[PDB]
Enzyme design. Sequence first.
Site, PDB file in Angstrom:
ATOM      1  N   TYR A 214       0.744  -1.276   0.051  1.00  0.00           N
ATOM      2  CA  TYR A 214      -0.044   0.002   0.086  1.00  0.00           C
ATOM      3  C   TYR A 214       0.906   1.092  -0.132  1.00  0.00           C
ATOM      4  CZ  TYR A 214      -3.573   3.466   0.685  1.00  0.00           C
ATOM      5  OH  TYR A 214      -4.404   4.501   0.626  1.00  0.00           O
TER       6      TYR A 214
ATOM      7  N   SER B 221      -5.515   0.536  -4.722  1.00  0.00           N
ATOM      8  CA  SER B 221      -5.600   2.342  -4.853  1.00  0.00           C
ATOM      9  C   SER B 221      -4.032   2.634  -4.865  1.00  0.00           C
ATOM     10  CB  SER B 221      -5.832   2.600  -3.390  1.00  0.00           C
ATOM     11  OG  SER B 221      -7.241   2.208  -3.164  1.00  0.00           O
ATOM     12  N   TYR B 222      -3.542   3.212  -3.742  1.00  0.00           N
ATOM     13  CA  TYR B 222      -2.243   3.761  -3.592  1.00  0.00           C
ATOM     14  C   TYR B 222      -1.373   2.844  -3.706  1.00  0.00           C
ATOM     15  CZ  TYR B 222       1.443   7.072  -2.527  1.00  0.00           C
ATOM     16  OH  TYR B 222       2.619   7.946  -2.492  1.00  0.00           O
TER      17      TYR B 222
ATOM     18  N   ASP C 103     -15.556   3.923 -10.840  1.00  0.00           N
ATOM     19  CA  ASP C 103     -14.737   4.432  -9.975  1.00  0.00           C
ATOM     20  C   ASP C 103     -14.966   5.773  -9.879  1.00  0.00           C
ATOM     21  OD1 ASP C 103     -13.043   5.259  -8.063  1.00  0.00           O
ATOM     22  OD2 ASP C 103     -11.687   3.248  -8.430  1.00  0.00           O
TER      23      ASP C 103
ATOM     24  N   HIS D 151     -14.277   2.131  -6.986  1.00  0.00           N
ATOM     25  CA  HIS D 151     -13.223   1.943  -6.253  1.00  0.00           C
ATOM     26  C   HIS D 151     -12.852   0.685  -5.112  1.00  0.00           C
ATOM     27  CE1 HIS D 151      -8.991   3.244  -5.652  1.00  0.00           C
ATOM     28  NE2 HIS D 151      -9.151   3.588  -4.565  1.00  0.00           N
TER      29      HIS D 151
END
Lengths: 726, 726
Positions: free
Chosen positions: B509, B592-593, B670, B702
């Site tokens: 992450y 995500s990140y 998203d 998302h």
Amino acid sequence: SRKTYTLTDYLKNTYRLKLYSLRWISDHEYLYKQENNILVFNAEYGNSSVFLENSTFDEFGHSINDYSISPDGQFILLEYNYVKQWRHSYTASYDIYDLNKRQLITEERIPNNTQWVTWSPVGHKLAYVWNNDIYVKIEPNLPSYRITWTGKEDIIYNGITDWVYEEEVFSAYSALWWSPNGTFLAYAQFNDTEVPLIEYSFYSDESLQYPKTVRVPYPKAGAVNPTVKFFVVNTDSLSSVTNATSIQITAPASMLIGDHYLCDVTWATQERISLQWLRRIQNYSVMDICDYDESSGRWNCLVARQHIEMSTTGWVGRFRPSEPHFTLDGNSFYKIISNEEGYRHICYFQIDKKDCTFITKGTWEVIGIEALTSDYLYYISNEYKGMPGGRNLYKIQLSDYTKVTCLSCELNPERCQYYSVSFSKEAKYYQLRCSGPGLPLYTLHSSVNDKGLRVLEDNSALDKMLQNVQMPSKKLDFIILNETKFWYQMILPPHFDKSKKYPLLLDVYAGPCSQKADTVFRLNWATYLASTENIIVASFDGRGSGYQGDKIMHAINRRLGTFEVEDQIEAARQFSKMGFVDNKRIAIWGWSYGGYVTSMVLGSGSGVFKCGIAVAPVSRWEYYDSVYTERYMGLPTPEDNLDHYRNSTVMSRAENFKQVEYLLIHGTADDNVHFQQSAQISKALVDVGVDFQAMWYTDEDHGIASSTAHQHIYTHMSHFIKQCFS
Amino acid sequence: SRKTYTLTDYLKNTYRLKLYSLRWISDHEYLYKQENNILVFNAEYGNSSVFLENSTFDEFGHSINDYSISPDGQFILLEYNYVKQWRHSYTASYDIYDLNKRQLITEERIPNNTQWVTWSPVGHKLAYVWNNDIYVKIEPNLPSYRITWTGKEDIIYNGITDWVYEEEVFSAYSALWWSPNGTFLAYAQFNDTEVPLIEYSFYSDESLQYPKTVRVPYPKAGAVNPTVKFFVVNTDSLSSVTNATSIQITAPASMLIGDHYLCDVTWATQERISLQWLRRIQNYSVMDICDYDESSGRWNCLVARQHIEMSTTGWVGRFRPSEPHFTLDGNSFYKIISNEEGYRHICYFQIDKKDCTFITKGTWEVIGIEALTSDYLYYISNEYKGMPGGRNLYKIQLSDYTKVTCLSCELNPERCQYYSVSFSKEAKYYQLRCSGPGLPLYTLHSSVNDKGLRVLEDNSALDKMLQNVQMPSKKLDFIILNETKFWYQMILPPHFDKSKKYPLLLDVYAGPCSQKADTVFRLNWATYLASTENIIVASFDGRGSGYQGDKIMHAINRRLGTFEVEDQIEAARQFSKMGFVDNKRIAIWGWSYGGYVTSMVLGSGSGVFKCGIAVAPVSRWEYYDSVYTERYMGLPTPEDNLDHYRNSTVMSRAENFKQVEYLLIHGTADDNVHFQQSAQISKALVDVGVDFQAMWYTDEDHGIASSTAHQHIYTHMSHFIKQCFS
Ligand SMILES: N[C@H]1CN(CCc2ccc3c(c2)OCO3)C(=O)C[C@@H]1c1cc(F)c(F)cc1F
């Protein structure tokens, strides 16, 4: 032996097919564009002269992707700043170069972002569309003339078609038609006011921070269609102070009663023009023939001079009702219509006589009327050797129909069984284009004797090269499904051995009136799959196929997604039973309509296919355009054909994909078959718990033709088939 | 032995974790919702009584997904017709049930499509937002009161946040704050008038003929932000004929000079409220403290009573500046701020004294201030055993800071090193929530002695089950990068053997202030990958990590996409050197990140990773929202940090993907990390000739959390990792 036709060969085009693209500018000379300069050739002797030097435009300060020479020889329209739109439409900038004074005309030039430009048939007149309006330029250097004033982006189209008319009925962006001598200019006007819009994202360059929403008027099955109007203006009675008067040609009554289309416009004479109208239910079409009333300026389409063309078994025309071909005096015309036996042949009409006379007949069809003289009628059919995947040029004597003569059949039976032709202005000379089964061959002949004058291109260079490589072989043959015979073709690997058992890929399209089994020579993905991967790539033309008579073609009427997919499975099921097929490794793939069928076939639960690939497929007909879908499916209302509209989706079969390996590919910017259709296919699969492969192609449309996308999508698919087979 | 934790176990949730969700309704009782009915428990003895029968609403004619009991005990807000929106926002219908007369109130009911409803802190007052406007209901059955009249969909928000404030700063949809005794109602107003819109297609049900275009006000990095205003109305001086007067609290001047945000609102007393403002360059934040002027109705925030919180090394706060905790008399407050050594600790403030006094200190951080009494201050930190991946409840004596006492550390050191707490209204009782490293454990205690009253849930049932299965083990430990120590954790297979060489998956992450190495017990995809596939699933917290002091966290300031990805590679590079890692089979994945980092890492050309999976990643920061991106990257202008904004994209590294196997997954709907970001990643790869796998999830955002999408996306990924490893 040496090497095979690799994937890189296909993608990098290392083996280049040679063409011979000429442009008849008279009945004796044609223009032969070369890479650098443009030549002019004397059909008779062949002597040639440079029409304009390649250097002539060195410092034009703009890349020119296209030229257009006035039927005057006096001017050259120069196209640049080409910005493609849909399948046919696009905008560009234009400059006219004077061949007389060899000067670039700089005054009153054509606007940038011009949608369409076109010379008159004889002089050097110009008609162009800009901002959906029509302008006329009687002289390359004179002020323009506004013909229309109602143009409004995305709403009102003048002289150019909207999305559906472009893609579906005219297969062109242009909706304007000059008369034989340039005197009159006819045009259509489309109104998309109440046509729903299709919206999708376009991400553009990385630097584009916010994606843009592209929205275009697109009527999906059953939606509100654009409306149409026809006008004929006199490019000779136009001032520079007055607003040009466009005389409207309306009706017919049998068409105004409800939703209708304008499906054809062909000028008969200097003052006579014919229009063909089609009801939304493409069952009934009406052709009107209008004369220009000398002392009234208006146009009169006499009832009694109109002909009805309908069908009880299916729709009218292969795609749109045929084009009429008028005799010099315009008092009669020849056109291809369906037989009483269901075969499309040439019918001879008297403009004011209700019944026509069939001049050809038989269990084969006339593909197209190529040229007409006071003496003969030149057409192309698939009669020879009785094989519908062939094409030959024929000429019939108008005085005795008994006297039909094939002009291509024997030229080289071994190498050529698929011709296309290109006549000079008066049909004094003609160029035959052989595209198979051997290497493409281009030759020139003269109509007076059908004497062969000389070979224009024999692809000898390509041939020399191809002998240093193990090429695949092509087999064109048929099988027999209860009485009827259906053709298929297989791309066989080098050193094919009927003893061995090869994996098989079924290349499928199967759209109505389609033909995947022919005698054309092709260097494509199949070439590679067979040459290097030793995979047999077959294609079968079953119910729905075209060029074999309506009994076969109309078989899928109001019933898409049924027999045509059913027979594809049937073909494979037989192919496997031919002993050289490893029925354990049988795959299927198709693009567009072929993608729809691939999906339907993979969702049939037939068990015949192990894996498959659908590229930009249709999932449910209520998503495709009105004009196309309704021609075959009727209207999606409970009073018409909604029930079947619902029974033939791909999602409804999602469950049966558990049994197969599937790859779904679709371009995100597809304006034709919207990404939506695949978004609904994946959603159904996910809701049913089916795993599959996917791949979207950002900013690519129905073609996925951009250089990088093209090479990318075949590489991905190649891996997929290899994985599924090796 | 028996069996392992399979993928189906994870997807089908065959091994269910037990919780104990209670709701304190006083300082002595809490409500324990059971599946059927709702009980009420006596914290002291434990005796319980049914608060309301499960059958009570049998024929309510609507499914109720949520209840809300007035702080009166007198009423129950019933939520139904739940229609989710963004991460926190959603709309619903509401009915209020009277526990007195046990009657469903039917007059003046709350509107349908209400965005937010909330009781006052003490009585049974109601404030709700409908159509972006604020309404107040002094009585469950009385007519409503319009507080605001400026509401306009997508433009003006009253009492509710817009997209970015919801997701980024408040982490809630609600933007209204009642005062301690319900007298006053404060609220924020957002104006998105000039905020650009993000647009994407939503295909919806198969029956939806034309996809719809969803468009929401979303400011991407550097774009125009929404503006904010604050108001405080008196819910006691409101007529039914007059338009309620909302007194605005503006400034500060040091914030009005330019773009700013409202990042926190906390009431001090019955008449005193504090606001925290933050400049767009989240370097400088100002806290104002306003009192209500008795004989003027207005509010005054005295300069002198405001505190500036800034940072020279990075941004202010972990995510947003900390929340102040006021003493009973509101004349002083405690809040977590950064140390002079860079560690977040508790500082004691006098509302009118500029300097505060740190009550805690050390090389560990205070996670959060849980409760405050006139006697103690309860907080949760990761001080114990000096491991930042732990969490324990502590209490410090306000009279002597020297007297700090851990209340969770020793309860069960073996099974619990990660607690969260929940205090009763006056902090007389509290429930400790142990979530690892062993099975979750819920217990109740009393603050007077910190005596253990009883176990609320020990997951014994889950334990009995898990012993019949070969579970994976978790190792939490650190490594040393030039001086500093960084923690990592590995999910080890059953019967792990340091002699054998396992394939390794790096679960990543690495977002700023993130923490993937902790002592929490989890039953997820990693559990399966290790238990059944014998794959070690590691996680490393390097530069950028949180809870370890700013020297580590602010390391990536104005420099995202650098050290945090660099250290992920470093960690793997070491993991391989530990002898039980097959450095030939090392993979990496993140969402995500973590997806952004996975991509950056796979495009680093490190050679360390063979394959990888990015799920809904960020490709370039100019695509993400302003509030988040600018907190770490500053503004994308050439005067600020545009150069690095450009150096850290994923596309710019496309070339280096030739060396790896990549899987790109993204939901089409998203709204957070737009599909656009992956559409730009694939385009770059195609333009560079790199083959990779892809998978879009139509209509999923998302989260890709819908039942079918969730099971689908892990199945697809599981296959991918297996292929890449076996
Ligand atoms: N869009 C269709 C256009 N078309 C007819 C072109 C045409 C027009 C006029 C004419 C013609 C041919 O011959 C003589 O006069 C096709 O051949 C198929 C095209 C298709 C089918 C699908 F089902 C897809 F999904 C996607 C698609 F593009």
